[PDB]
């Protein structure tokens, strides 16, 4: 080999060493992406007039029934993906020293 296997192993270890860091960096990006997507989709509450304060609480109640349906539809898509992933993965799978050194020396 053109290089030592000790360097070859040292380079492989540094490749995963940063690939992990890019993954945690990716999680921090996704954490910020979520908070931004939540300040847009869930504009926080702030106050009212006892009469026309209610028609917003009525509007919130109708929102929950729609949000959870949108949450169900994307969930059932993730659920069907789990079925295919496990199905696809099923298809492809088919295709002592220290105790001696002391008892010697």
């Amino acid at each position: 080999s053109k290089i030592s296997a000790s360097r070859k192993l040292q380079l492989k270890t540094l490749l995963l060493q940063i690939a992990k860091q890019e993954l945690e960096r990716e999680a921090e990006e996704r954490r910020g992406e979520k908070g931004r997507a939540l300040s847009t989709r869930a504009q926080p509450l702030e106050l009212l007039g006892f009469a026309e304060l209610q028609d917003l609480a009525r509007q919130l109640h109708a929102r929950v029934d729609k949000v959870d349906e949108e949450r169900y539809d994307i969930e059932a898509k993730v659920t069907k993906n789990i079925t295919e992933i496990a199905d696809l993965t099923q298809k492809i799978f088919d295709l002592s020293a220290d105790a001696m050194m002391q008892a010697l020396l």
Partner: protein, 67 residues
């Protein structure tokens, strides 16, 4: 005039259209908390959906090449 439509919209009336202004204060709060928590579940369910399309595509490449 639908039977299941009239009954659906009544869920608001039975839960909101009847009581206090001081309870409506601390009831409209928990109604937003439920949306925010469901909007958070929807974000994470969307993100997992993106990763599965990559997971599935990589599998479609492996199943083909290994044949």
């Amino acid at each position: 005039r639908e039977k299941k439509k009239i009954l659906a919209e009544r869920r608001k009336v039975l839960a909101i259209d009847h009581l206090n202004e001081d309870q409506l204060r601390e009831k409209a709060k928990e109604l937003w908390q439920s949306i925010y928590n469901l909007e958070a579940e929807k974000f994470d369910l969307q993100e997992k959906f993106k990763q599965q399309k990559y997971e599935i595509n990589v599998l479609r490449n492996r199943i083909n090449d290994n044949q």
